[PDB]
Design a protein around this ligand. Structure first.
Ligand SMILES: [Mg+2]
Ligand SMILES: [Mg+2]
Ligand SMILES: [Mg+2]
Ligand SMILES: [Mg+2]
Ligand SMILES: [Mg+2]
Ligand SMILES: [Mg+2]
Ligand SMILES: [Mg+2]
Ligand SMILES: [Mg+2]
Ligand SMILES: [Mg+2]
Ligand SMILES: [Mg+2]
Ligand SMILES: [Mg+2]
Ligand SMILES: [Mg+2]
Ligand SMILES: [Mg+2]
Ligand SMILES: [Mg+2]
Ligand SMILES: [Mg+2]
Ligand SMILES: [Mg+2]
Ligand SMILES: [Mg+2]
Ligand SMILES: [Mg+2]
Ligand SMILES: [Mg+2]
Ligand SMILES: [Mg+2]
Ligand SMILES: [Mg+2]
Ligand SMILES: [Mg+2]
Ligand SMILES: [Mg+2]
Ligand SMILES: [Mg+2]
Ligand SMILES: [Mg+2]
Ligand SMILES: [Mg+2]
Ligand SMILES: [Mg+2]
Ligand SMILES: [Mg+2]
Ligand SMILES: [Mg+2]
Ligand SMILES: [Mg+2]
Ligand SMILES: [Mg+2]
Ligand SMILES: [Mg+2]
Ligand SMILES: [Mg+2]
Ligand SMILES: [Mg+2]
Ligand SMILES: [Mg+2]
Ligand SMILES: [Mg+2]
Ligand SMILES: [Mg+2]
Ligand SMILES: [Mg+2]
Ligand SMILES: [Mg+2]
Ligand SMILES: [Mg+2]
Ligand SMILES: [Mg+2]
Ligand SMILES: [Mg+2]
Ligand SMILES: [Mg+2]
Ligand SMILES: [Mg+2]
Ligand SMILES: [Mg+2]
Ligand SMILES: [Mg+2]
Ligand SMILES: [Mg+2]
Ligand SMILES: [Mg+2]
Ligand SMILES: [Mg+2]
Ligand SMILES: [Mg+2]
Ligand SMILES: [Mg+2]
Ligand SMILES: [Mg+2]
Ligand SMILES: [Mg+2]
Ligand SMILES: [Mg+2]
Ligand SMILES: [Mg+2]
Ligand SMILES: [Mg+2]
Ligand SMILES: [Mg+2]
Ligand SMILES: [Mg+2]
Ligand SMILES: [Mg+2]
Lengths: 18, 126, 110, 46, 102, 56
RNA sequence: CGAAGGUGUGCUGUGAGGCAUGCUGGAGGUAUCAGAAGUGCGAAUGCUGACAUAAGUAACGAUAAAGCGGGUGAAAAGCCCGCUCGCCGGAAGACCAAGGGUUCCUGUCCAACGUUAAUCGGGGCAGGGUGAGUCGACCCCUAAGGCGAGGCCGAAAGGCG
RNA sequence: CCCGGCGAGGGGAGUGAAAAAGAACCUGAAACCGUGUACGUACAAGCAGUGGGAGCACGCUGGCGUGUGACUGCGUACC
RNA sequence: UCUGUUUACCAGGUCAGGUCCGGAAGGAAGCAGCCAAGGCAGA
């Protein structure tokens, strides 16, 4: 849902550029 | 709250589905600013993450701030890796504590929309 | 073996910090840590920090057992002091000195 | 109490503004001296 | 009128590399050159996640003053000094000792 | 009134001779938990004289 | 194989001085006899910078006033939330003009700034924010007053109109 | 790498001839502030030194230097 | 001596995950979880 897409998206991704 | 228990289960539920070619194509705004090939090695790094979070005693996970020099020697020895990698894994966990406490305070839309992509001057990449 | 930990440019005067520094001189660092815990001063928490750091240094770098450590030399020097201005009555003004200090703690197994 | 500087823009500019200087011989001498000392701004303008 | 150029093989006169030979990567405006296998420095690099740059100590090549490198004569096996003449109508470089063109 | 001559570091030392703090001698050790603490003051865990009288 | 300078120490001259040398320093110094002097400092209520002293003293800006629970957090008398208490109310409220010029709102940070701490701010850094035929300015019209073609006047500049 | 607040600052490690060259960065003087050691000081009157001088400490090879200076003679800054 | 629960690495055994050696066969040091075990208790 919304908290699973806000979990996974910025988890995988915002672990990428940082 | 948010611990390395929920981070353990976050990353072990995310080491089933996690991939870098399926999740660098599910966002159009973050793969054009930072490079599209800086994503991750998902299986290597998530099996690393799960390894390192297996090296912990359970109150070292539920209370991540008591992890010190001896604790990181013991964790880095447990899974066969470097103390620096465990350093950067507890770093990553710290960033995600930041983000999910921010998602706790601010409404889901005002903390997902005010999210910023950042460069050091307007010229591309420097 | 001697080990250093320093904190440089701390806000407090040398003078105020000296009061506390001179409480812990000579004790073994356990007993001294407690002396510092229940001292009510600002300098106390500054110096507590520096002392603890010093212990970490000794153990991690030089492989000293914590039990044996004493505080052999602890001294507070003057730091760079910054001028400010407080306006005073009838127009005259006052160059203010916001003082800082160098807390230097050194521990040894001997 | 009531101090000496009570600012006004229209006042400021009619008194010291560029055009006000340029009006006269003396003023253009001011603007001469300034241009010779090489100021950042000659007059008071916004 | 520039004596030392890209891709010339040179020999190093001065420094820790004295006597070593190598190939020029590029030149810089300040009169500095950067030579293959020459003047390695060990540089510390803070890991950068955007460029996927790991950390660590990278051995890199640091610029050397162009006065310190001589154009290597392959014929004589000696360092040489260079000069200019006009062959055809074109401006060309030659070695001072055997006066042969490059 | 304001001083007539610059008082030497000597005098300045003397005046400060009394200004030294007193290190607290005793650290009472609570029976149940065993942590050190002040006489008559509760511990960091809220223990006093063997009770846990604060839940905190 | 270590110059000038810094710091010691030893020796020597009637004196200003000189020589030698341990540490520091890391590249300039200079015999001899002459030459030229911005040539020697403790004072000038001397000039600049630095550091003292009184002294951890006076003071912390209205005598309208605070108390508790919870939250955040390294740390909460001061921040957010709730609850009672108290002060202003022809103002200590609300809207403008002037004047200021981003101080507005959000996120984030706590060195300096805030007369204490500060997690807070009118502080730092990044972003956003000001939507007009009918509200103002502009514009149309003139007041006092200004400038003023010709003109009158004045050594020149200029004054009056 | 470690302490700390994902601080300040520090300590190791590494570069370098050198990091008492670390950006608060050549040289780093004095005032001024300290920590350590020797000596003296809690019955003692004064421009604080000079003359005499016991003891103690440290260097030397029972004497000679060095620091200190109990006790007493004389002794009211400079411009 | 049963049961309740406590003790990160630096007593023991199992030692998942992960990691070293090997092409492979397999071994191995051992983090966590569990059980001894040591704290403290109901008897
Ligand atoms: Mg005033
Ligand atoms: Mg007088
Ligand atoms: Mg006092
Ligand atoms: Mg030398
Ligand atoms: Mg010399
Ligand atoms: Mg000279
Ligand atoms: Mg000299
Ligand atoms: Mg010298
Ligand atoms: Mg040197
Ligand atoms: Mg040297
Ligand atoms: Mg000379
Ligand atoms: Mg002469
Ligand atoms: Mg002169
Ligand atoms: Mg002078
Ligand atoms: Mg004189
Ligand atoms: Mg005066
Ligand atoms: Mg200056
Ligand atoms: Mg003063
Ligand atoms: Mg003082
Ligand atoms: Mg007083
Ligand atoms: Mg008083
Ligand atoms: Mg007063
Ligand atoms: Mg007072
Ligand atoms: Mg006030
Ligand atoms: Mg609270
Ligand atoms: Mg409260
Ligand atoms: Mg208050
Ligand atoms: Mg409230
Ligand atoms: Mg009224
Ligand atoms: Mg007005
Ligand atoms: Mg305005
Ligand atoms: Mg601003
Ligand atoms: Mg605001
Ligand atoms: Mg804000
Ligand atoms: Mg403050
Ligand atoms: Mg406070
Ligand atoms: Mg603070
Ligand atoms: Mg602001
Ligand atoms: Mg209108
Ligand atoms: Mg008119
Ligand atoms: Mg005319
Ligand atoms: Mg006129
Ligand atoms: Mg740091
Ligand atoms: Mg080296
Ligand atoms: Mg300095
Ligand atoms: Mg140099
Ligand atoms: Mg220096
Ligand atoms: Mg010095
Ligand atoms: Mg000095
Ligand atoms: Mg008597
Ligand atoms: Mg006596
Ligand atoms: Mg007396
Ligand atoms: Mg004598
Ligand atoms: Mg001796
Ligand atoms: Mg003798
Ligand atoms: Mg003697
Ligand atoms: Mg005498
Ligand atoms: Mg006399
Ligand atoms: Mg007398």
């Amino acid at each position: 849902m919304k908290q699973s897409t806000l979990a996974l998206l910025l988890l995988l991704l915002l672990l990428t550029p940082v | 709250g948010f611990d390395l228990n929920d981070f353990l289960e976050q990353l072990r539920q995310m080491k089933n589905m996690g991939g870098x070619x399926x999740x660098x194509x599910x966002x159009x705004x973050x793969x054009x600013x930072x490079x599209x090939x800086x994503x991750x090695x998902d299986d290597k790094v998530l099996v690393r993450m799960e390894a390192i979070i297996n090296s912990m005693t359970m109150k070292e996970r539920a209370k991540p701030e008591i992890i010190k020099g001896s604790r990181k020697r013991r964790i880095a020895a447990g899974c066969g890796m470097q103390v620096q990698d465990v350093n950067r894994l507890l770093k990553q966990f710290d960033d995600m504590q930041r983000m999910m406490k921010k998602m706790k305070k601010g409404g889901x839309x005002x903390x997902x929309x005010x999210x910023x992509x950042x460069x050091x001057x307007x010229x591309x990449x420097x | 073996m001697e080990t250093i930990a320093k904190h440089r440019h701390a806000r407090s005067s040398a003078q105020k910090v000296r009061l506390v520094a001179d409480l812990i001189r000579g004790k073994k660092v356990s007993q001294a840590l407690d002396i510092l815990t229940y001292t009510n001063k600002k300098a106390a928490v500054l110096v507590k920090k520096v002392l603890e750091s010093a212990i970490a240094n000794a153990e991690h770098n030089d492989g000293a057992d914590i039990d044996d450590l004493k505080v052999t030399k602890i001294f507070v020097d003057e730091g760079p002091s910054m001028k400010r201005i407080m306006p005073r009555a009838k127009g005259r003004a006052d160059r203010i000195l916001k003082r800082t200090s160098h807390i230097t703690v050194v521990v040894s197994d001997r | 109490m009531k101090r000496t500087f009570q600012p006004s823009v229209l006042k400021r500019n009619r008194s010291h503004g560029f055009r006000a200087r340029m009006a006269t011989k003396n003023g253009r001498q001011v603007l001469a001296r300034r241009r010779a000392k090489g100021r950042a701004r000659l007059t008071v303008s916004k | 009128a520039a004596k030392i150029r890209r891709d010339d093989e040179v020999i190093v006169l001065t420094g820790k590399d004295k006597g070593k030979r190598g190939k020029v990567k590029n030149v810089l405006s300040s009169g500095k050159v950067i030579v293959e296998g020459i003047n390695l420095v060990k540089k510390h690099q803070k890991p950068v996640p955007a460029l996927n740059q790991p950390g660590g100590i990278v051995e890199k090549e640091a610029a050397i003053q162009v006065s310190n490198v001589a154009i290597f004569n392959a014929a004589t096996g000696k360092a040489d000094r260079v000069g200019f003449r006009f062959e055809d109508g074109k401006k060309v470089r030659f070695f001072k000792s055997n006066s042969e063109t490059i | 009134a304001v001083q007539q001559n610059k008082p030497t570091r000597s005098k300045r030392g003397m005046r400060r001779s009394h200004d030294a703090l007193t290190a607290v001698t005793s650290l009472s050790v609570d029976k149940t938990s065993g942590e050190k603490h002040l006489r008559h003051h509760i511990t960091a865990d809220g223990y006093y004289r063997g009770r846990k009288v604060i839940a905190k």
